[PDB]
Structure 1
Amino acid sequence: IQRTPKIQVYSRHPAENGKSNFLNCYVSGFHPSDIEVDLLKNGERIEKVEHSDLSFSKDWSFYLLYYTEFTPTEKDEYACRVNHVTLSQPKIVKWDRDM
């Protein structure tokens, strides 16, 4: 009884400079009840991160979405660190500006 998760880090609006944007980190396909997900602004943890409701899919496996508000920049990058039961080290996923 163990399911390794799947991480997708993306954005709602296109990455236009000067305009506000929403970052979304979506973890899906796992069955512990506890997961430790943080958002990182070039290594520094984002303080105010709101959450959605923890539901499950058709295969009885969880999914959790975190979202935050930012302004996209060519220099600025973002990461989503996920600590999980299956992960001996916390997996860090870098945000892509196209995916």
Structure 2
Amino acid sequence: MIQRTPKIQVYSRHPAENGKSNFLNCYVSGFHPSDIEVDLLKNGERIEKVEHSDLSFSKDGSFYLLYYTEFTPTEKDEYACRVVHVTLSQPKIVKWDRDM
């Protein structure tokens, strides 16, 4: 058996074809096993609607999750990603850094 804790990156992107759109992204990468819970949070509250979740695996069976959705950030709001995984003794919460 193998277990590997996910790497977690939280960042924002505009599609180049439409700069009127801002997306918040959680890239959860390289994890074993694939069982996982991933949420985006705004000011500590779960964002229910997340339009996109792209899931893949590598040759060695590691999982790669891109979880992302359109959002309209203000300087006031705190965004974060909350991950629950067998490798984590408590849920891991990773904040969005505004300048990313």
Place the TM-score, normalised by the shorter chain, in its bin. 0.7 to 0.9
Give the drift of 1:69. 1.3
Q: So what's the TM-score if we normalise by structure 2?
A: 0.85
Distance 2:47 2:17 in 1: 21
Overall identity of the aligned pairs, in %: 98
Runs of 4+ in 1 over 6 A off after TM superposition: 14-18
Question: Residues 81 and 92 of structure 1 are in contact (CA less than 8 Å); yes or no, is this contact kept in structure 2?
Answer: yes
Give the drift of 1:88. 0.9
Give the drift of 1:18. 12
Distance 2:8 2:41 in 1: 15
Q: So what's the TM-score if we normalise by structure 1?
A: 0.86
**Root-mean-square deviation over aligned CA pairs:** 3.1
Question: Residues 14 and 20 of structure 2 are in contact (CA less than 8 Å); yes or no, is this contact kept in structure 1?
Answer: no
Structure 2: stretches of 5+ with no match in the other structure = none
Distance 2:34 2:52 in 1: 15
Structure 1: stretches of 5+ with no match in the other structure = none
Count of residue pairs the alignment pairs up? 99
